[PDB]
Design a protein around this ligand. Structure first.
Ligand SMILES: NC(=O)c1ccc[n+]([C@@H]2O[C@H](COP(=O)([O-])OP(=O)([O-])OC[C@H]3O[C@@H](n4cnc5c4nc[n+]4cc[nH]c54)[C@H](O)[C@@H]3O)[C@@H](O)[C@H]2O)c1
Ligand SMILES: NC(=O)c1ccc[n+]([C@@H]2O[C@H](COP(=O)([O-])OP(=O)([O-])OC[C@H]3O[C@@H](n4cnc5c4nc[n+]4cc[nH]c54)[C@H](O)[C@@H]3O)[C@@H](O)[C@H]2O)c1
Ligand SMILES: O=P1(O)OC[C@H]2O[C@@H](O[C@H]3[C@@H](O)[C@H](n4cnc5c4ncn4ccnc54)O[C@@H]3COP(=O)(O)O1)[C@H](O)[C@@H]2O
Ligand SMILES: O=P1(O)OC[C@H]2O[C@@H](O[C@H]3[C@@H](O)[C@H](n4cnc5c4ncn4ccnc54)O[C@@H]3COP(=O)(O)O1)[C@H](O)[C@@H]2O
Lengths: 473, 473
């Protein structure tokens, strides 16, 4: 768990992303942990050429402009520097991979590198990268996300926004990008990551949006790390910097941009992981097959499964089922009862009955893996089939459990149902920290209660629902 | 004399002002020597309220914005502060008076005080002050200059541009002022005095003009004082500041704004005085009356006066004559010969014959004073009339000389012509430093040669012309 402000932000932004109305605004700071050297370090020889010192200079745009002025406006050196630095092959950080995995269809970047593009490519996602006005007129077919590199690309250094002339001519040359960013800011919920909010173009666009929409501006989010006490600095200077950052944060709200203050930069990764987990765990994989329903009678167990599926649908969960013999019909009935109040939404219930025959069993493993990949939580019930006239614990449920563990999915074996479910519950309880690291007391209590045969249908269903909810929320 | 760069700027800007195509852009720094306390000093309690320190802050606009943010956007305190400070009664500095005396019809000010307006009022000039969009639609009749207070007026503190919100909404609210300033920058030659070129609105306007006109931007001038070594600073920091200022100066050239580097702020007053002197001394008051032309014959002296007036007209001088008996006709003939090559331009020759009779002599003194006020250089020739049949040295020429001295006009008595002119030359040579303080060797030689009877017409005329030119140029 994190700070209550962080928890509220995680809930709200997960809600925004699940509606596919969220955009990510990534600054250069999101790529400073990857391995690219700092822009000030690159400009250090540039500053030394014109007799300045990059450490004593805070406005690097004016520094680059001065360098260009000293060379009759020529940018060849700076173009070569940025091409040499930001085109290097660097391993992607976890933040880029998580952002690629999230269902985010809009990225706006002020960085010249192609880390977002590579992260989207490695997720088998089609990325429509735009850094030219002409490129706005063409859309890639079946694209997953669109990346607006509003400061240019690394492979086109001459069109990168680096000097004051570029910023001064941006409003004329790149006006369609300004219009697109204004439309996204008024129509989408943005998350600013790695952005210092010192960019003149972004200040201009935000001021225009504020002038247009007054107090009815759309709420956006930013992630900013708190000020850290430098070794040379004194306590008074640190407190002054903290107060300055607080005043900076309120001016941002002047633009209806709420700032989340983070202790360190790994909290960005933690927040992204939490959002990804909240999105992924909303889909539950219901597994099991039952000819004999352990201690419970047939009708009682059927009603239990029906009401469990109805509660899962009611709690805004998407059920994926393999249509196991003896369990599939009743989860289908529960979903139908919950939804027919109507049509079957494709997202709420995904049914994947296994092909029957010799041909089907060849691809059964890949079918099972594809079915499980859609989910983030696996729920196992019973696990008994009939082979030679006798009830024998099934083997498909064990394979599903193995696949779920290999995919880092949460496993919720209900031991009260018995058979392979009870075996899996015993296995999980044998090594609880391996499957649920850092579990709370309530989580342990719910997991232990999952193997209670004295619970009624309602009590067991409520225990399962609460366990799945604390896993997801 | 000043630096050759300063001399070239003085010549070029005097040429621009004499064509009435010059405008003055005055910053707040032009009013910092008058007695108004610094804006940082005013914001010091404002900074202390929000927990900041105005000495550690450089962007006071952001400081005021932070204060407004801490008070729900209320500006009452800042409005009261600026109204209390900049509405005080302060004596005008010499710069404002000189600028008011110059034939400049366009002022653009970022200061809220009314020092330019008061300076124009004290010169009996009609000033059309504009700080509202509506005021642009009305023009004062017979106005001498128009003052655009583009950051608001002191008497309207709520509309002053002080905080970041004002700068962000300036491009929408005060767009007509932006258009007017762009038109003036492309149609008039500006002189920036007291301006630090750190104003976002001026940067935006200059960037737009540059984007519109590329390398064909009109040349403008700025006056900037060089960096001074602070007592606490080291030599390396001073050299770094000097280099930073040099880079700042070349960037302004990016906007075709040439910067004149001044050792101190009194050089602004010196430059303004030099421009005023160059404008004022271009009008010469030709005085004298002659019945007997000393040693020279009548025809010889008439030809001398004719050619002297022709040379004065040829050297771009405007002649004002009282039509004295024996001198007026021949200066008129010289002007006519120089101009009829055509019509008599009203500026080139102003003729003020004295009224004859008892009624005229009552107002003769005011007539003489008004006639002399139009000029900056007085040239005296002969000075002899006839009263009772005998040649007697005149008394009107002495009154003219007294009026010229009282108005601080340069006096050029030609002693070779004799009579009152010789008496005046002797009086000037008696106390030469009183009339020509800091005179060079060439000026003294020319003044001494002015009383040489051995010179021909051409030599004496050339001596007079060179003396008047070194007085003017
Ligand atoms: O304006 P801009 O877009 O050009 O950004 P900038 O001025 O180059 O980089 C300055 C910004 O970079 C941000 N920043 C620094 N390091 C990190 C970071 N954010 C995340 N992580 C993750 C690991 N490391 C970091 C930091 O939040 C700061 O606001
Ligand atoms: O607002 P702004 O951007 O218009 O100007 P600023 O930032 O307030 O004032 C900073 C500017 O004030 C200028 N400056 C300081 N003192 C003087 C001065 N110029 C002439 N004189 C004459 C006497 N004293 C001065 C100085 O040239 C500097 O550029
Ligand atoms: O019980 P298990 O070991 O694992 C159970 C899991 O598997 C999947 O459902 C089973 C099974 O109910 C279904 N099935 C239905 N009718 C027959 C049949 N399979 C073989 N038959 C021979 C004659 N009639 C049948 O075929 C799936 C594959 O077979 P297994 O994976 O071996 O089944 C679910 O997702 C369930 O979670
Ligand atoms: O010579 P001065 O002492 O000074 C000379 C200066 O004055 C002005 O011209 C004189 C003078 O030429 C003119 N004037 C012409 N004709 C007569 C006459 N004045 C009296 N008259 C009586 C009978 N007929 C005349 O009347 C101006 C006033 O008379 P004064 O100032 O006394 O003339 C110039 O600017 C000259 O520079």
């Amino acid at each position: 768990k994190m700070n209550p402000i962080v928890e509220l932000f995680i809930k709200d932004f997960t809600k925004e992303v699940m509606e596919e109305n969220a955009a990510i605004f990534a600054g250069a700071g999101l790529s400073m942990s990857v391995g690219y050297v700092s822009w000030a370090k690159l400009l250090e020889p540039i500053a030394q050429e014109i007799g300045l010192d990059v450490n004593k200079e805070n406005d690097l745009v004016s520094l680059a402009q001065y360098y260009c002025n000293e060379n009759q406006g020529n940018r060849g050196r700076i173009n070569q520097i940025i091409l040499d630095e930001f085109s290097r092959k660097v391993d992607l950080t976890e933040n880029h991979k998580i952002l690629a995995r999230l269902p985010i269809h809009t990225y706006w970047t002020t960085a010249y590198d192609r880390l977002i593009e590579k992260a989207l490519e490695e997720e088998n996602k089609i990325a429509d990268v735009k850094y030219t006005v002409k490129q706005l007129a063409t859309t890639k077919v079946k694209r997953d996300a669109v990346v607006y590199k509003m400061h240019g690309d690394v492979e086109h250094p001459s069109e990168a926004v680096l000097i004051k002339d570029d910023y001064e001519k941006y409003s004329i040359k790149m006006d369609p990008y300004i219009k697109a960013l204004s439309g996204d800011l008024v129509s989408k919920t943005f998350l600013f990551v790695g952005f210092s909010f010192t960019d003149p173009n972004l200040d201009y666009i935000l001021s225009r949006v504020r002038s247009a929409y007054e107090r009815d501006q759309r709420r956006h989010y930013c992630l900013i790390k708190k000020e850290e006490r430098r070794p040379d600095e004194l306590e008074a200077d640190f407190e002054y910097r903290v107060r300055k950052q607080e005043l900076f944060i309120s001016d941002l709200s002047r633009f209806n941009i709420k700032t989340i203050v983070l202790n360190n930069y790994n909290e960005i990764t933690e927040i992204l992981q939490r959002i990804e987990n909240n999105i992924k765990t909303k889909t539950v994989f219901l597994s099991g097959s039952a000819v004999e329903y352990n201690h419970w009678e047939t009708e009682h167990a059927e009603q239990f499964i029906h009401q469990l599926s109805k509660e899962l649908i009611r709690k805004d969960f998407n059920i994926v089922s393999g249509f196991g013999l003896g369990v599939g019909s009743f989860v289908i009935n529960g979903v139908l009862e919950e939804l027919y109040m109507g049509t079957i939404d494709d997202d709420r219930l995904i049914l994947r009955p296994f092909p029957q025959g010799k041909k089907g069993e060849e691809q059964w493993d890949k079918y099972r893996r594809d079915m499980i990949t859609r989910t983030g939580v696996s729920i196992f019930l019973y696990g008994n089939k009939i082979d030679k006239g006798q009830v024998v614990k099934a083997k498909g449920v064990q394979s599903e459990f193995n696949i779920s563990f290999e995919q880092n999915n949460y496993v919720v074996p209900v031991g009260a149902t018995g058979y392979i479910a009870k075996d899996l519950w015993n296995k999980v309880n044998e090594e609880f920290e391996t499957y649920y690291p850092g579990a709370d007391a309530r989580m342990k209590k719910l997991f232990g209660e999952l193997n209670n045969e004295a619970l009624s249908i309602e009590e067991l269903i409520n225990t399962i629902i609460e366990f799945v909810e604390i896993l997801s929320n």
